[PDB]
Amino acid sequence: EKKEEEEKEEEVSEEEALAGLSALFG
Amino acid sequence: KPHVNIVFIGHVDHGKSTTIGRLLYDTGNIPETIIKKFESFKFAWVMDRLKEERERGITIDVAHTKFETPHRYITIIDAPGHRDFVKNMITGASQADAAVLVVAATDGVMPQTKEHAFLARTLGIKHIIVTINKMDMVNYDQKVFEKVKAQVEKLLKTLGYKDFPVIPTSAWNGDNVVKKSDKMPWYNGPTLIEALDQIPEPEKPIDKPLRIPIQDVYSIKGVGTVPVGRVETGKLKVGDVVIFEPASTIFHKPIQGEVKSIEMHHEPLQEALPGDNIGFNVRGVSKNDIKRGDVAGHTDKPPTVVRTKDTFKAQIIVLNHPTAITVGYSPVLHAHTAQIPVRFEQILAKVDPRTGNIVEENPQFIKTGDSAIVVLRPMKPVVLEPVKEIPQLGRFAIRDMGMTIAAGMVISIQKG
Ligand SMILES: Nc1nc2c(ncn2[C@@H]2O[C@H](COP(=O)(O)OP(=O)(O)O)[C@@H](O)[C@H]2O)c(=O)[nH]1
Numbered sequence: 001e002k003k004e005e006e007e008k009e010e011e012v013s014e015e016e017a018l019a020g021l022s023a024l025f026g
Numbered sequence: 027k028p029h030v031n032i033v034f035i036g037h038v039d040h041g042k043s044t045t046i047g048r049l050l051y052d053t054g055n056i057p058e059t060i061i062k063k064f065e066s067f068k069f070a071w072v073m074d075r076l077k078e079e080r081e082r083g084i085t086i087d088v089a090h091t092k093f094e095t096p097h098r099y100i101t102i103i104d105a106p107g108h109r110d111f112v113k114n115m116i117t118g119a120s121q122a123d124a125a126v127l128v129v130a131a132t133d134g135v136m137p138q139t140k141e142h143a144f145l146a147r148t149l150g151i152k153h154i155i156v157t158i159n160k161m162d163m164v165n166y167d168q169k170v171f172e173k174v175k176a177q178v179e180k181l182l183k184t185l186g187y188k189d190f191p192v193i194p195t196s197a198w199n200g201d202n203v204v205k206k207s208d209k210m211p212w213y214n215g216p217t218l219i220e221a222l223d224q225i226p227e228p229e230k231p232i233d234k235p236l237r238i239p240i241q242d243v244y245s246i247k248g249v250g251t252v253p254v255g256r257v258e259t260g261k262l263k264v265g266d267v268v269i270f271e272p273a274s275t276i277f278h279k280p281i282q283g284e285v286k287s288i289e290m291h292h293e294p295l296q297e298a299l300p301g302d303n304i305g306f307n308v309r310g311v312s313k314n315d316i317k318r319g320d321v322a323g324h325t326d327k328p329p330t331v332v333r334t335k336d337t338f339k340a341q342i343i344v345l346n347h348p349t350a351i352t353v354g355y356s357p358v359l360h361a362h363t364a365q366i367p368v369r370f371e372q373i374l375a376k377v378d379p380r381t382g383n384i385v386e387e388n389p390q391f392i393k394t395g396d397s398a399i400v401v402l403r404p405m406k407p408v409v410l411e412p413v414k415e416i417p418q419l420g421r422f423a424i425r426d427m428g429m430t431i432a433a434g435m436v437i438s439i440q441k442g
Binding site: 014017018020021024 | 137140141147148181184339374375387437438
């Protein structure tokens with residue numbers, strides 16, 4: 001279940017990346 | 027039949043070339059050089075020959091391959107993977123009606139997938155068609171399709187698109203590219219070629235708000251002030267009230283008046299249309315109040331002004347500056363009829379000229395050949411519009427020391 005936490009963390013990181021793109025192209 | 031231009035986007039290896047190839051192959055629109063090469067004819071051999079043409083230096087922009095559908099003429103005008111990809115999109119040499127965004131079923135949406143989607147929104151491409159490719163490599167499974175579709179929906183909705191098709195394809199075997207698949211009964215939407223057939227005609231310049239960049243201004247004895255310029259968008263009528271920017275902003279009062287008369291080739295008109303080179307007599311406007319580089323619009327939707335206390339954000343391609351460009355660079359920006367000094371305030375991202383992928387956030391410097399996202403402050407007020415809204419007023423060149431440093435397109439304006 002450490003694996004589940006890591007998947008979520010990585011998923012959120014990718015959402016943060018999307019937000020960085022929204023800011024860059026905003 | 028209306029003509030429509032398309033671009034292919036998506037992560038390297040997700041299947042852009044293969045999908046184009048499959049479109050060409052299954053419609054029999056094989057390039058002539060390949061037909062001659064041939065003089066066994068399987069899809070795989072054709073892909074090899076399209077690849078070989080690419081390696082000989084025939085790039086998609088140059089090949090500008092075309093096919094016909096029942097309601098369209100379709101030109102494939104560009105795709106990432108060649109030296110001038112970003113330059114063509116920025117300069118407007120390649121203008122796309124739609125983007126086909128290819129996402130592999132095996133990998134899902136990747137960081138570069140999202141970057142190309144942003145590039146598409148930035149350019150003003152209103153119509154997206156997503157393919158979820160390599161369906162054959164995931165056993166034509168609906169669940170896999172549905173999981174990637176949800177990723178894609180989440181990305182494109184965040185960007186502001188809506189109701190784009192999402193089509194499961196195998197460019198390699200052909201499923202849902204031109205021929206309806208028999209391996210995916212669970213899908214009932216359009217094939218890629220059907221979705222291409224339904225790309226709507228582009229919004230007409232006449233339907234955008236009026237913009238007339240002023241080239242020159244006359245003051246004729248017993249007639250008054252007569253600016254001269256080209257109608258870029260919208261339409262101008264005798265009787266209309268027009269306002270001039272940045273004249274109005276600089277003077278802190280409306281520089282505006284009623285159009286007494288219009289003329290092209292020294293002959294009277296009652297209305298001017300996009301592309302017309304006109305003179306127009308405006309009452310109540312003094313010769314001194316307007317000048318080259320002003321822009322006229324209706325009072326309804328006045329031309330957007332970037333003041334010295336504002337910034338704007340642009341994507342550029344560096345054409346000629348072999349030494350480092352760094353924050354504080356202060357060349358001259360030329361757009362429509364204006365020229366103003368501009369300062370580079372931030373370089374937010376360095377961008378791969380071949381693909382439109384981001385190379386680096388907040389780079390220290392850029393050079394010839396780099397693309398970049400930049401924040402610029404005008405040192406005198408200037409009319410600019412985001413290219414995605416009014417492209418005719420969204421592109422510009424940067425000049426310094428007699429030469430052309432860069433070409434750019436306006437992303438957004440920051441009111442300061
Ligand atoms: N099995 C399978 N392979 C594919 C498909 N689409 C592309 N490929 C293969 O994947 C690799 C990359 O495809 P390509 O069209 O070059 O991707 P691009 O880099 O996006 O243009 C090539 O080796 C293709 O043969 C597909 O639908 N199914």
